[PDB]
Design an enzyme around this catalytic site. Sequence first.
Site, PDB file in Angstrom:
ATOM      1  N   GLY A 184      -2.526  -0.909  13.417  1.00 53.60           N
ATOM      2  CA  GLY A 184      -3.095   0.350  13.219  1.00 53.60           C
ATOM      3  C   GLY A 184      -1.529   1.110  12.782  1.00 53.60           C
ATOM      4  N   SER A 186       0.297  -0.681  10.430  1.00 53.99           N
ATOM      5  CA  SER A 186       1.171  -1.198   9.211  1.00 53.99           C
ATOM      6  C   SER A 186       0.685  -0.327   8.240  1.00 53.99           C
ATOM      7  CB  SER A 186       0.183  -2.701   8.790  1.00 53.99           C
ATOM      8  OG  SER A 186       0.150  -3.615   9.864  1.00 53.99           O
ATOM      9  N   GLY A 187       1.840  -0.343   7.240  1.00 53.86           N
ATOM     10  CA  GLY A 187       2.093   0.011   6.439  1.00 53.86           C
ATOM     11  C   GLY A 187       3.296   1.556   6.217  1.00 53.86           C
TER      12      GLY A 187
HETATM   13  C1  LIG Z   1     -11.139  -8.428   8.018  1.00 49.20           C
HETATM   14  C2  LIG Z   1     -10.355  -6.747   9.041  1.00 49.20           C
HETATM   15  O1  LIG Z   1     -11.533  -6.365   9.447  1.00 49.20           O
HETATM   16  C3  LIG Z   1      -9.566  -6.959   7.813  1.00 49.20           C
HETATM   17  O2  LIG Z   1      -8.698  -7.176   7.873  1.00 49.20           O
HETATM   18  N1  LIG Z   1      -9.555  -4.998   7.492  1.00 49.20           N
HETATM   19  C4  LIG Z   1      -8.469  -4.571   6.887  1.00 49.20           C
HETATM   20  C5  LIG Z   1      -7.514  -4.381   7.760  1.00 49.20           C
HETATM   21  C6  LIG Z   1      -7.221  -2.811   7.553  1.00 49.20           C
HETATM   22  C7  LIG Z   1      -6.168  -2.134   8.212  1.00 49.20           C
HETATM   23  C8  LIG Z   1      -5.406  -2.867   9.257  1.00 49.20           C
HETATM   24  C9  LIG Z   1      -5.612  -4.133   9.618  1.00 49.20           C
HETATM   25  N2  LIG Z   1      -5.189  -4.465  10.603  1.00 49.20           N
HETATM   26  N3  LIG Z   1      -5.558  -5.705  11.515  1.00 49.20           N
HETATM   27  C10 LIG Z   1      -4.716  -5.965  12.074  1.00 49.20           C
HETATM   28  C11 LIG Z   1      -3.362  -6.102  12.241  1.00 49.20           C
HETATM   29  C12 LIG Z   1      -2.547  -5.945  12.672  1.00 49.20           C
HETATM   30  C13 LIG Z   1      -1.762  -6.467  13.325  1.00 49.20           C
HETATM   31  C14 LIG Z   1      -0.660  -6.677  14.092  1.00 49.20           C
HETATM   32  C15 LIG Z   1       0.173  -7.148  14.469  1.00 49.20           C
HETATM   33  N4  LIG Z   1       1.864  -7.030  14.412  1.00 49.20           N
HETATM   34  C16 LIG Z   1       2.166  -6.125  13.386  1.00 49.20           C
HETATM   35  C17 LIG Z   1       1.510  -4.924  12.736  1.00 49.20           C
HETATM   36  C18 LIG Z   1       0.098  -5.233  12.648  1.00 49.20           C
HETATM   37  N5  LIG Z   1      -1.551  -4.838  11.378  1.00 49.20           N
HETATM   38  C19 LIG Z   1      -4.001  -4.261  10.676  1.00 49.20           C
HETATM   39  O3  LIG Z   1      -3.462  -3.836  10.475  1.00 49.20           O
HETATM   40  C20 LIG Z   1      -6.188  -4.840   9.078  1.00 49.20           C
END
Ligand SMILES: C[C@H](O)C(=O)NCc1cccc(-n2ncc(-c3cc4cnccc4[nH]3)c2O)c1
Lengths: 247, 56
Positions: A184, A186-187
């Site tokens: 949540g 990320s970015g």
């Molecule tokens: C096929 C699956 O549906 C997919 O890949 N969708 C794309 C998609 C979009 C938007 C978000 C995410 N997404 N999933 C998991 C994490 C994430 C784990 C984590 C641990 N520590 C720090 C930052 C972290 N971030 C994350 O940002 C993924």
Amino acid sequence: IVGGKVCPKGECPWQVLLLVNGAQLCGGTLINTIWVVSAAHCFDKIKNWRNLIAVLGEHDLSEHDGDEQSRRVAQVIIPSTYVPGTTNHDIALLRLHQPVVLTDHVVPLCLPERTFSERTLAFVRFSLVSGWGQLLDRGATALELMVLNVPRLMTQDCLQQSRNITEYMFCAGYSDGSKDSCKGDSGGPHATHYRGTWYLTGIVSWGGCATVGHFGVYTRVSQYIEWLQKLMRSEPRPGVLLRAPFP
Amino acid sequence: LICVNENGGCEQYCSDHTGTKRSCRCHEGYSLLADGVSCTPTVEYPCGKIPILEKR
Ligand SMILES: C[C@H](O)C(=O)NCc1cccc(-n2ncc(-c3cc4cnccc4[nH]3)c2O)c1
Ligand SMILES: [Ca+2]
């Protein structure tokens, strides 16, 4: 964000919230009135590219207070070298459809020069990471913007202290499972203070949130300064997604 | 004064030049003071400053 604190409203004025169909997608960082830096992986599964929204001036997701500014995302630019579902080159540059208006609650983070970032910023120990991500591993996301002070590790040290980190990444945080960025977030920004001003040094990437024996992984923005700057000088192209050569 | 060391004494950005020469620079929305090192805002909302804190 695990183990942080609420960012007092207005104290993280560069933070962006990205929405798709009104749902929380990711964070971002405002670097100019029309440009947001986020993580490439945020866009791996986007179906309708037309339904992406960036919100500036957000704080408490439960309410509207009038400081929020929403914009459509006109362009999502991703390096050629990024491979969906992976971690390397995890960066995106987003062009807003209309500029945001700078206010007490909406202010860009400085995108530093590469030299400055490498020579100086890279050696500032602590930096802030922020977002509305999970408050706990396998937990609910935050309703108020959270912020966390994390220390940066040299990659050699990261590898050692860890119970694949490329030149396009860096480690920061803690290995004791208490404090980290999470899904949540990320970015979102990893922001570094130097002599009275804040700069963009990292992007919350992914890979395991506040996992004992592991550190957070961030995209090393310094590697991308020239790439970003060139794109910001370029004209928009039809179609939202653009893959741009890197370097 | 070299840019690699102590940021060349610059508040922000630093360039090495031919000889024992150095020039500091500032981000857009800032100007360089006569000290040749300090940067001062030229706009209301310069990057990387927090208005509510700058006001107090
Ligand atoms: C096929 C699956 O549906 C997919 O890949 N969708 C794309 C998609 C979009 C938007 C978000 C995410 N997404 N999933 C998991 C994490 C994430 C784990 C984590 C641990 N520590 C720090 C930052 C972290 N971030 C994350 O940002 C993924
Ligand atoms: Ca709100």
